[PDB]
Amino acid sequence: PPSKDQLNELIQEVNQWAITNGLSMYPPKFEENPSNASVSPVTIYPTPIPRKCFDEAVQIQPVFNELYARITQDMAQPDSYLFTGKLWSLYLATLKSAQYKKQNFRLGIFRSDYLIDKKEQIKQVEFNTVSVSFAGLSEKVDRLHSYLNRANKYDPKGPIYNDQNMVISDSGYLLSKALAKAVESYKSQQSSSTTSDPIVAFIVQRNERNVFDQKVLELNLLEKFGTKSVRLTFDDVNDKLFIDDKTGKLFIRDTEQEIAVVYYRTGYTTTDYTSEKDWEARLFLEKSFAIKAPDLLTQLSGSKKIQQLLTDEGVLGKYISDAEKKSSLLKTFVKIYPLDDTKLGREGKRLALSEPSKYVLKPQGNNVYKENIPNFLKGIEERHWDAYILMELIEPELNENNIILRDNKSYNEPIISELGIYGCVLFNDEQVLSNEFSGSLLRSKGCLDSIILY
Amino acid sequence: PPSKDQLNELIQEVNQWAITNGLSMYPPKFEENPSNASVSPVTIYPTPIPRKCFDEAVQIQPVFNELYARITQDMAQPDSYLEFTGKLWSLYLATLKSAQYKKQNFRLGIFRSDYLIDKKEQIKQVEFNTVSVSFAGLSEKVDRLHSYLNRANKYDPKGPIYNDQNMVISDSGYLLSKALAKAVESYKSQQSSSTTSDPIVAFIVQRNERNVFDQKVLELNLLEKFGTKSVRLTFDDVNDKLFIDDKTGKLFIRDTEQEIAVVYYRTGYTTTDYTSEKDWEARLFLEKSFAIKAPDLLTQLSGSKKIQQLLTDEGVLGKYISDAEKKSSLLKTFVKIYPLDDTKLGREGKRLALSEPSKYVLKPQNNVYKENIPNFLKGIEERHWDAYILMELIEPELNENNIILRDNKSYNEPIISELGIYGCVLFNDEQVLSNEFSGSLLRSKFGCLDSIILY
């Protein structure tokens, strides 16, 4: 409930800090004047997240990184079970033999997204294996809120928050560290008796409006890890790059700059491929000796279908033996149960009648929600119950005490928040070489938000 | 000259880096939507400046800071012989009225010396600013922009085109913030309290300020590097939110009880900054408080053009500076003017007018320029020559190898550059407590921010 003028002053303080710190994005049709940018949509205050849930999300990221790395490794062998059609087509095309040894190292830059269910437990709503965004702006919104607290902007008399509870993410720096690590492992594969300064190629979308989020990684790579980079669209890839047919190494025509890492910030949706040449550009990159982040299989490993398959204890067990790690993951999954007499089905029926409010009954015509479940099933013979499945419902913690700033307008409405956990993993055909937690993100609905632990 | 495509790519690199780093400013009428900002006008490449000239400029700043501090102290003594200006002096006289409390004797000068590189190389001061000097913050950013473009292979995909050792990277944003923090601590150090005290810096700003991002760098450095908070107030805010404790004169913000240790002006140096009698009253209210002003009325007045000219005279200068060496160094930077009569400097003037005419301009105290002087003086009479004055002209080194970026339009025109040197000085009635060089600036025009490459 900020005073109307307390709020107005607070809003301009946000605009001034954000612009001064590049917490920005290009508005539509920025191509008409690329020297103008706007403040990114953000909340004014941090959103409360339970400390216990946050620590578990952070702690479990390495286990998810490893899981998807193992799934990717398994998929590289048609002797297992694990838009997607074209991607798969490109994959098969990379199987074609070449005269140079192919690049075995892959870089996975991921992000796990959770909802804080309070039917507190984190529930995974998504695991992203390709082109994850906002690692750069996340750091800035966190620092914006921290500053507003420490500079007495939230309250002229003093901080209204305990700095020890305000999360400040280093995702921008950590993602750049992951890219620098991939470049060094590329260089380390073969030394030179000449200077070698391979770079990171950012493959971007034409007319990218969120470039400033990406620029943070480019600048950290340079200033912190001495690594240079270039921004290329599928057009630029087709026009400016070439492959040494003897080594498969990727270079930029005329300049001779060598590309060690192909970092995708586009290519995760059917419209990212505007023409057939764009598909050929992707294939061309995947075939090169450069380390892809991510390569085709890694991207495919994140298919919603596979995510669904992994919610099955039996399937999960095939990739994770440890009982402890297995239970930590399943705990975060949205549970689904059949209503037959199989082992799981008996559990389903027991839950449907003992804790109905936690679920929704969906047909395999209408769904039946929560407290209406028992009565509904009572009117159907138990033998026909398997005509439906029981699905766990997520009831997120709504924040009613926050203000969303967008285009200089403030909105004081209820918001739901999604917790994002970045993760980075470097792996080859059979082993994981590097596995790390890479920062956090919080988005409400959309806009960037920050975390306050309680 | 970069190829058309090499330039468009470089322009895109500039916009991206600049926005990501806040090297920005509000466009006209930003009031409509303050959530949008544009890239500040800047050059694409750094401008060449003689290392010798740059070092002399840096080295003499402390001498200039001290000269103007002494002038101010001299002006502060009553028995001392030493329209907008009249109004300022008017306010000053008002501060002379007694009070229940002991007046604040410490003042902070945040100055900036501006020089042209005369190639007749010698630095020639064209201006000395004693109030609300700008660009200390964006200055650091344009320097880092150019360094980035060089080190990240944007100027040339094959490698840097400049020796990083010759690229000046100013810390003026940080140094100006340190000067302010320094003023805050000396304010706090005047009298202790057994209980935590955290006075702030008050930025007095212009209404609808478009160059706020340059100023924000100072605000952020103060907090992050010196743990000092601050507030942005227009003269309207000063009148509505501040109040003075009659027993101590101390300045406070109503209701919050936050104490203001330093009043830092980023407005109030030109007549249009005062939109009404109320604004003038706000200035006086601030000047009478116990807070340390940056700068106070008298320091501001020491920067008037008359005084600056009064100083170009070796006689008046010698009053505030003994050391022949310090004096000679200062005089070298001033634009010389000569009398054309039968005195000491007179014969020297005539000699110069006929020996090196191309270096001066003759003016009646129509101007007769350069190579035309001996002729003009020949047809007249020496005894009558006294009806003129010989002034040396500054023929600055033009840079024709740069590109200026403004509102996404690039200009490849020759440019003249002005080298700015920031300086901070803390002083009381008779002594100088702190005197530092505080960073550099390079502004160019056919205006925009530029950076320095030494040679």
Tab-separated table of N, CA and C in Angstrom, chain B residues 31-134:
chain	number	residue	atom	x	y	z
B	31	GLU	N	9.229	13.168	-20.432
B	31	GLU	CA	8.207	13.228	-19.369
B	31	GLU	C	7.019	12.325	-19.685
B	32	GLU	N	6.680	12.247	-20.970
B	32	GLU	CA	5.577	11.426	-21.438
B	32	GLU	C	5.761	9.938	-21.108
B	33	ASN	N	7.003	9.462	-21.167
B	33	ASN	CA	7.281	8.057	-20.860
B	33	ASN	C	8.737	7.921	-20.426
B	34	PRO	N	9.006	8.119	-19.127
B	34	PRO	CA	10.340	8.042	-18.525
B	34	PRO	C	10.925	6.628	-18.446
B	35	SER	N	10.267	5.646	-19.059
B	35	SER	CA	10.774	4.286	-19.012
B	35	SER	C	11.562	3.974	-20.277
B	36	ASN	N	11.713	4.983	-21.134
B	36	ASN	CA	12.460	4.843	-22.384
B	36	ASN	C	13.616	5.833	-22.461
B	37	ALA	N	14.786	5.341	-22.864
B	37	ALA	CA	15.958	6.195	-22.999
B	37	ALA	C	16.732	5.886	-24.266
B	38	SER	N	17.548	6.840	-24.703
B	38	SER	CA	18.336	6.670	-25.923
B	38	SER	C	19.833	6.735	-25.651
B	39	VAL	N	20.605	6.170	-26.566
B	39	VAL	CA	22.054	6.179	-26.458
B	39	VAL	C	22.574	7.616	-26.584
B	40	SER	N	23.527	7.972	-25.730
B	40	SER	CA	24.111	9.312	-25.757
B	40	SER	C	24.951	9.494	-27.023
B	41	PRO	N	25.018	10.723	-27.550
B	41	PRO	CA	25.815	10.952	-28.755
B	41	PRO	C	27.278	10.677	-28.432
B	42	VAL	N	27.930	9.894	-29.286
B	42	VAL	CA	29.323	9.552	-29.067
B	42	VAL	C	30.085	9.325	-30.372
B	43	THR	N	31.408	9.383	-30.282
B	43	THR	CA	32.242	9.115	-31.420
B	43	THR	C	32.410	7.585	-31.421
B	44	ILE	N	32.781	7.025	-32.564
B	44	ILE	CA	32.966	5.589	-32.704
B	44	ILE	C	34.392	5.228	-32.275
B	45	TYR	N	35.343	6.074	-32.649
B	45	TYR	CA	36.725	5.879	-32.307
B	45	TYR	C	37.233	6.933	-31.297
B	46	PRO	N	38.409	6.690	-30.710
B	46	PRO	CA	38.993	7.639	-29.755
B	46	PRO	C	39.710	8.723	-30.557
B	47	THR	N	39.851	9.911	-29.981
B	47	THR	CA	40.538	11.016	-30.671
B	47	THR	C	41.962	11.144	-30.151
B	48	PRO	N	42.931	11.322	-31.055
B	48	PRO	CA	44.353	11.461	-30.699
B	48	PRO	C	44.662	12.740	-29.920
B	49	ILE	N	45.387	12.593	-28.803
B	49	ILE	CA	45.774	13.708	-27.954
B	49	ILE	C	47.221	13.465	-27.524
B	50	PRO	N	48.074	14.503	-27.575
B	50	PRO	CA	49.468	14.320	-27.174
B	50	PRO	C	49.592	13.907	-25.710
B	51	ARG	N	50.352	12.838	-25.457
B	51	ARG	CA	50.565	12.360	-24.101
B	51	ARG	C	51.106	13.490	-23.233
B	52	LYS	N	52.036	14.259	-23.787
B	52	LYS	CA	52.638	15.383	-23.055
B	52	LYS	C	51.572	16.412	-22.629
B	53	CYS	N	50.662	16.727	-23.542
B	53	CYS	CA	49.602	17.677	-23.241
B	53	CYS	C	48.648	17.129	-22.189
B	54	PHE	N	48.318	15.844	-22.283
B	54	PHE	CA	47.413	15.218	-21.337
B	54	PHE	C	48.008	15.181	-19.937
B	55	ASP	N	49.290	14.846	-19.827
B	55	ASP	CA	49.959	14.798	-18.526
B	55	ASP	C	50.066	16.186	-17.890
B	56	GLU	N	50.366	17.205	-18.690
B	56	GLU	CA	50.442	18.557	-18.124
B	56	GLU	C	49.071	18.981	-17.564
B	57	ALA	N	48.000	18.635	-18.294
B	57	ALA	CA	46.640	18.987	-17.878
B	57	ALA	C	46.293	18.328	-16.558
B	58	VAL	N	46.588	17.041	-16.461
B	58	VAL	CA	46.333	16.299	-15.226
B	58	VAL	C	47.153	16.898	-14.080
B	59	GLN	N	48.427	17.138	-14.345
B	59	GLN	CA	49.357	17.652	-13.343
B	59	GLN	C	49.021	19.029	-12.776
B	60	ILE	N	48.517	19.926	-13.609
B	60	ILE	CA	48.210	21.271	-13.130
B	60	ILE	C	46.848	21.452	-12.471
B	61	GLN	N	45.942	20.489	-12.642
B	61	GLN	CA	44.617	20.618	-12.030
B	61	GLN	C	44.666	21.054	-10.558
B	62	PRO	N	45.474	20.365	-9.727
B	62	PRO	CA	45.579	20.719	-8.305
B	62	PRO	C	45.954	22.178	-8.097
B	63	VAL	N	46.781	22.717	-8.993
B	63	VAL	CA	47.207	24.118	-8.905
B	63	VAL	C	46.004	25.051	-9.201
B	64	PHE	N	45.174	24.668	-10.172
B	64	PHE	CA	43.979	25.448	-10.491
B	64	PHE	C	42.983	25.333	-9.344
B	65	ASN	N	42.781	24.113	-8.815
B	65	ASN	CA	41.849	23.930	-7.695
B	65	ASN	C	42.234	24.885	-6.560
B	66	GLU	N	43.521	24.902	-6.231
B	66	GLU	CA	44.026	25.733	-5.141
B	66	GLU	C	43.880	27.239	-5.433
B	67	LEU	N	44.104	27.630	-6.681
B	67	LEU	CA	43.981	29.035	-7.084
B	67	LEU	C	42.548	29.530	-6.846
B	68	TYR	N	41.571	28.776	-7.335
B	68	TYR	CA	40.173	29.160	-7.157
B	68	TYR	C	39.689	29.022	-5.703
B	69	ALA	N	40.302	28.116	-4.943
B	69	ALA	CA	39.940	27.988	-3.543
B	69	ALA	C	40.453	29.242	-2.799
B	70	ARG	N	41.662	29.686	-3.143
B	70	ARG	CA	42.249	30.849	-2.505
B	70	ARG	C	41.458	32.101	-2.898
B	71	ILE	N	41.037	32.185	-4.158
B	71	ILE	CA	40.266	33.324	-4.626
B	71	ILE	C	39.013	33.398	-3.758
B	72	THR	N	38.348	32.257	-3.604
B	72	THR	CA	37.126	32.185	-2.821
B	72	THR	C	37.360	32.630	-1.373
B	73	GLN	N	38.455	32.168	-0.774
B	73	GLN	CA	38.775	32.531	0.609
B	73	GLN	C	39.058	34.028	0.710
B	74	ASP	N	39.680	34.585	-0.321
B	74	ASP	CA	39.991	36.003	-0.333
B	74	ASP	C	38.697	36.795	-0.465
B	75	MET	N	37.793	36.311	-1.313
B	75	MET	CA	36.506	36.968	-1.507
B	75	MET	C	35.684	36.885	-0.222
B	76	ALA	N	35.965	35.864	0.587
B	76	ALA	CA	35.244	35.640	1.838
B	76	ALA	C	35.616	36.613	2.970
B	77	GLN	N	36.754	37.288	2.843
B	77	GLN	CA	37.167	38.238	3.870
B	77	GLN	C	36.607	39.621	3.500
B	78	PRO	N	35.875	40.257	4.432
B	78	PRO	CA	35.258	41.580	4.238
B	78	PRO	C	36.184	42.717	3.823
B	79	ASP	N	37.233	42.949	4.608
B	79	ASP	CA	38.179	44.023	4.325
B	79	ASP	C	39.045	43.744	3.104
B	80	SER	N	38.868	42.574	2.500
B	80	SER	CA	39.649	42.215	1.321
B	80	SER	C	39.159	43.027	0.130
B	81	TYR	N	40.090	43.483	-0.700
B	81	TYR	CA	39.730	44.260	-1.874
B	81	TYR	C	39.016	43.388	-2.901
B	82	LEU	N	39.270	42.083	-2.849
B	82	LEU	CA	38.639	41.148	-3.777
B	82	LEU	C	37.251	40.759	-3.280
B	83	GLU	N	22.950	40.637	-14.576
B	83	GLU	CA	21.868	40.637	-13.534
B	83	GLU	C	21.907	39.360	-12.680
B	84	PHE	N	22.099	38.214	-13.337
B	84	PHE	CA	22.175	36.912	-12.672
B	84	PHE	C	23.194	36.985	-11.536
B	85	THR	N	24.378	37.502	-11.849
B	85	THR	CA	25.464	37.666	-10.879
B	85	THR	C	25.043	38.542	-9.713
B	86	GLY	N	24.286	39.588	-10.018
B	86	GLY	CA	23.830	40.492	-8.970
B	86	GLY	C	22.900	39.777	-8.017
B	87	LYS	N	22.052	38.918	-8.570
B	87	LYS	CA	21.123	38.146	-7.761
B	87	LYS	C	21.914	37.177	-6.847
B	88	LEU	N	22.906	36.493	-7.415
B	88	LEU	CA	23.729	35.562	-6.636
B	88	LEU	C	24.411	36.295	-5.490
B	89	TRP	N	25.014	37.442	-5.795
B	89	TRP	CA	25.689	38.240	-4.771
B	89	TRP	C	24.662	38.670	-3.751
B	90	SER	N	23.461	38.965	-4.231
B	90	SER	CA	22.380	39.371	-3.350
B	90	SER	C	22.160	38.257	-2.331
B	91	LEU	N	22.048	37.023	-2.812
B	91	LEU	CA	21.848	35.886	-1.899
B	91	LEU	C	23.018	35.778	-0.933
B	92	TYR	N	24.228	35.926	-1.449
B	92	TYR	CA	25.399	35.852	-0.588
B	92	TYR	C	25.271	36.815	0.581
B	93	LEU	N	24.949	38.073	0.287
B	93	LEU	CA	24.808	39.073	1.346
B	93	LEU	C	23.810	38.607	2.389
B	94	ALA	N	22.739	37.961	1.938
B	94	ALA	CA	21.743	37.442	2.862
B	94	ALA	C	22.347	36.405	3.829
B	95	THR	N	23.289	35.588	3.362
B	95	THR	CA	23.894	34.579	4.235
B	95	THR	C	24.771	35.197	5.323
B	96	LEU	N	25.136	36.457	5.139
B	96	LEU	CA	25.982	37.154	6.110
B	96	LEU	C	25.253	37.501	7.395
B	97	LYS	N	23.931	37.415	7.374
B	97	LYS	CA	23.133	37.706	8.557
B	97	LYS	C	23.373	36.661	9.655
B	98	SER	N	23.651	37.145	10.861
B	98	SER	CA	23.922	36.307	12.023
B	98	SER	C	22.909	35.181	12.231
B	99	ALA	N	23.265	34.236	13.099
B	99	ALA	CA	22.409	33.096	13.386
B	99	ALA	C	22.714	32.516	14.763
B	100	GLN	N	21.782	31.729	15.295
B	100	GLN	CA	21.964	31.112	16.603
B	100	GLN	C	23.129	30.141	16.577
B	101	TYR	N	23.356	29.528	15.423
B	101	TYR	CA	24.419	28.531	15.293
B	101	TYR	C	25.661	28.994	14.573
B	102	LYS	N	26.761	28.291	14.822
B	102	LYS	CA	28.037	28.569	14.180
B	102	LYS	C	27.890	28.119	12.726
B	103	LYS	N	28.176	29.011	11.785
B	103	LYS	CA	28.064	28.669	10.376
B	103	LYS	C	29.064	27.615	9.881
B	104	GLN	N	28.651	26.861	8.864
B	104	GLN	CA	29.504	25.830	8.293
B	104	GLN	C	30.677	26.500	7.553
B	105	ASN	N	31.906	26.204	7.975
B	105	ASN	CA	33.063	26.810	7.350
B	105	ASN	C	33.726	25.948	6.273
B	106	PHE	N	33.252	24.718	6.106
B	106	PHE	CA	33.809	23.853	5.078
B	106	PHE	C	32.989	23.911	3.790
B	107	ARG	N	33.681	23.991	2.667
B	107	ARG	CA	33.005	24.020	1.373
B	107	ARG	C	33.731	23.089	0.417
B	108	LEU	N	32.985	22.561	-0.545
B	108	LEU	CA	33.545	21.635	-1.502
B	108	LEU	C	33.458	22.209	-2.891
B	109	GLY	N	34.584	22.178	-3.596
B	109	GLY	CA	34.616	22.649	-4.961
B	109	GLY	C	34.776	21.446	-5.874
B	110	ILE	N	33.822	21.252	-6.790
B	110	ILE	CA	33.919	20.161	-7.754
B	110	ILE	C	34.019	20.911	-9.083
B	111	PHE	N	35.244	20.970	-9.588
B	111	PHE	CA	35.599	21.745	-10.762
B	111	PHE	C	35.934	20.965	-11.999
B	112	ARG	N	35.985	21.686	-13.111
B	112	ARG	CA	36.387	21.103	-14.377
B	112	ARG	C	37.072	22.117	-15.257
B	113	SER	N	38.313	21.818	-15.640
B	113	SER	CA	39.096	22.686	-16.524
B	113	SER	C	38.929	22.166	-17.944
B	114	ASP	N	38.689	23.064	-18.884
B	114	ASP	CA	38.533	22.680	-20.300
B	114	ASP	C	39.650	23.276	-21.165
B	115	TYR	N	40.341	22.423	-21.923
B	115	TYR	CA	41.427	22.858	-22.771
B	115	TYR	C	41.315	22.476	-24.228
B	116	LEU	N	41.898	23.316	-25.071
B	116	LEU	CA	41.992	23.023	-26.510
B	116	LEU	C	43.474	22.741	-26.722
B	117	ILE	N	43.795	21.873	-27.671
B	117	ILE	CA	45.194	21.578	-27.964
B	117	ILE	C	45.613	22.552	-29.067
B	118	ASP	N	46.399	23.559	-28.697
B	118	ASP	CA	46.851	24.564	-29.668
B	118	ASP	C	48.052	24.061	-30.444
B	119	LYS	N	47.949	24.074	-31.768
B	119	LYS	CA	49.045	23.621	-32.611
B	119	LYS	C	49.653	24.786	-33.394
B	120	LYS	N	50.262	25.729	-32.676
B	120	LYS	CA	50.893	26.883	-33.297
B	120	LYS	C	52.404	26.777	-33.181
B	121	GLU	N	53.086	21.374	-29.260
B	121	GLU	CA	51.668	21.439	-28.810
B	121	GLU	C	51.582	22.036	-27.409
B	122	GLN	N	50.533	22.823	-27.170
B	122	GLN	CA	50.336	23.460	-25.865
B	122	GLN	C	48.860	23.498	-25.495
B	123	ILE	N	48.548	23.140	-24.255
B	123	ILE	CA	47.160	23.173	-23.817
B	123	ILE	C	46.777	24.615	-23.491
B	124	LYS	N	45.605	25.023	-23.961
B	124	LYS	CA	45.096	26.359	-23.722
B	124	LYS	C	43.717	26.241	-23.083
B	125	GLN	N	43.603	26.712	-21.855
B	125	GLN	CA	42.354	26.653	-21.118
B	125	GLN	C	41.354	27.630	-21.721
B	126	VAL	N	40.185	27.117	-22.100
B	126	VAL	CA	39.159	27.959	-22.695
B	126	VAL	C	38.054	28.173	-21.670
B	127	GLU	N	38.118	27.416	-20.575
B	127	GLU	CA	37.104	27.537	-19.545
B	127	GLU	C	37.437	26.846	-18.233
B	128	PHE	N	37.028	27.471	-17.135
B	128	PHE	CA	37.174	26.858	-15.824
B	128	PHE	C	35.805	26.908	-15.177
B	129	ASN	N	35.213	25.740	-14.974
B	129	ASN	CA	33.884	25.618	-14.397
B	129	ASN	C	33.954	25.316	-12.891
B	130	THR	N	33.280	26.156	-12.096
B	130	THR	CA	33.290	25.995	-10.652
B	130	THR	C	31.960	25.487	-10.092
B	131	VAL	N	30.991	25.205	-10.959
B	131	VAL	CA	29.703	24.744	-10.468
B	131	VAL	C	28.997	23.776	-11.398
B	132	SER	N	28.323	22.804	-10.787
B	132	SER	CA	27.549	21.806	-11.514
B	132	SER	C	28.218	21.335	-12.809
B	133	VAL	N	29.426	20.798	-12.710
B	133	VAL	CA	30.104	20.325	-13.904
B	133	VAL	C	29.464	18.987	-14.265
B	134	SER	N	29.324	18.744	-15.558
B	134	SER	CA	28.690	17.525	-16.030
B	134	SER	C	29.600	16.493	-16.651
